[PDB]
Each structure stands twice: as C-alpha cells, then as structure tokens.
Amino acid sequence: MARKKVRPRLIAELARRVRALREQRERPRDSQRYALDYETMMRPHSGNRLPMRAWADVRHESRLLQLLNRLPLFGLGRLVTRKSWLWQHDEPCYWRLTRVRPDYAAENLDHGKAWGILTFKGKTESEAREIEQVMYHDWRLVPKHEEEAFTAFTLVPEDTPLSVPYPPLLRAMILAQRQKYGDTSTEEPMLNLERARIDPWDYPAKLEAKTKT
C-alpha cells in the first residue's frame, strides 16, 4: 500500500543503524554475562534468580571451563561427561572435544565456547557440534585410565513394537473406505512406528540452524 503524500522518514533508519552499531560495539563478554553470586543465587548482569532445583548442583560441582583450564591444550581429544546423564542413564554418555576457545575477560579463565563429538547412549555421531549448556555446574572429567572403561559399550537391541493398532474411530474409517471401494480384505490395519523415533528430551539440540537443503 502507498499514498501520494508519503514523507521520507529518516530518523527511524538512523536509530536502527546506531542501535545496531551500539550493540555490536558493546557486546557483553561471556565472563561478565554469566558471573554469578553463590550466596543470593542472583545474576548480577541479567538480574535473574536461579530456580531452587539448580541450587544444589551449583555449590557441589564445577562447570566445563573450570575443569578444562588445567589441561595442556585445553583438553583437546579428551572425554567430558555430565552429571545429568550419569544419574539418569546407566549407559555412558560423553563428549570428545574438538576445539575450544575461552574468553580472556575472566581473570580465572572460567568461561568460553567449545565444540565436540556427541556420544549418546553409546551412539556416536560423525559430525562436530557446538557444545550446549556449557555454563551449567554439572560437568565432570573422566580419567585417562578409565577412558576405555566408559568407551566400551554393550549394544542392546530395541524391543519396542514396530506396529501398533489404530485408534478405534480412525480404524473404522479405514475399514469403511476400503469396503466401499471394493477392497474386502479383513487384514487389520496397522501403524508404522518406525519413522516416529523420538530422541530423549535430555539430548542436546543443534545450536546452529539448518540452511536450505
């Protein structure tokens, strides 16, 4: 839509450039963004208070970079586990780090972004994914002599059914249509529960988006 009296507003575009310029120049650093007071459980930067379900793990554990700084090359090729998987999953779950770049703002070097290779329930992916939920105070590091103990895995086949009956009313319509069209076979319809595999909710999602394929 348009009219013959359109006025060329310029301040709106001017504000957009300056606002975009300011945020790029004043982008908060990871050290100051995630710094936390361990008594009030309050975030000085965002002003957010952590939920009570996460209070215990903060004071009784360390994040990824706290256990990764004291390594020669920031632990490239090392295996890193997480307390969340250890408590709920008997099968071993770990990350094989590929590269890691911490931020120099922190005086103790306790922050940064890291990548790695995912191993969930003994299933290994063939691509590198950026590590999600790094700042969480639940990570742990496995020893060198225990590396092969956790790496060893026993493959257990899945016993879930591959087909389930249709819901009752929807089952009737399937029978009704084929009977109407002449298909009088009395074979019970089934649903292929094979393309509907659901990853567990604790599985980390891809931080990077997906481009056109």
């Binding site: 819901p167 009752p168 009313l169 929807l170 319509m173």
Partner: protein, 117 residues
Amino acid sequence: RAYRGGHLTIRLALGGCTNRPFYRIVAAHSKCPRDGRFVEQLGSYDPLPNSHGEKLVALNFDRIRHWIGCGAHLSKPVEKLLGLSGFYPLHPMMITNAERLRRKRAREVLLASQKTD
C-alpha cells in the same frame, strides 16, 4: 493484524452468556485473541447436558486431519475432546486424573466406613 510469529493452533473459543458456556472448535493463529479472527471453524462443543443427558460435540474430521497434516498444534482440551471421540488415543493426563479419582474415592469410602465402626 500483522504478528511477528506464532503457530497455527486448533483451540476452543468461548461463547454464550454468563452461566451458559459454549465452545467453538476453531483454528486460528496463536497470537490472535481468543474470540478474534480465525482461519476456519471446525465444530462445536456444548458443555451442558440437554434433556436427553447428552453433551453434543461436532467435528469436521476431513478438515481436522487437514490442518493437523499441515502442522497445527493442539491445546490441552481439544486433545482430551478428540481422545474421547476415538480419533486420537486417550490423553495420558486423562487417564491419570481418572486414577486419582478412584484413589480419592477409595479413601473416601474407607474414611466413611472407619468412622461408622
């Protein structure tokens, strides 16, 4: 109205006067008001029993599976409503509420009889 985002959703829209509710099963953008503009009206759901003791429900089955096929989200009550009809399996929260009713009723029966004796 032009919204930033939102997902297509099938939900219940309230109607009728006070003390006489009446829900219309409608499919509209999630960011629009409850009684606001909608894409297509599917059915109806009368919450009060009539003289025959029936709560009437209407569903546009061929259209309902069309919107679900194109990626429409369902709210809590419509899933329970569809589950009763048999189009969908019984919602897990529908069963658990049933089980809670039995246990509360079982406690109620025992509590009344314990006081009796």
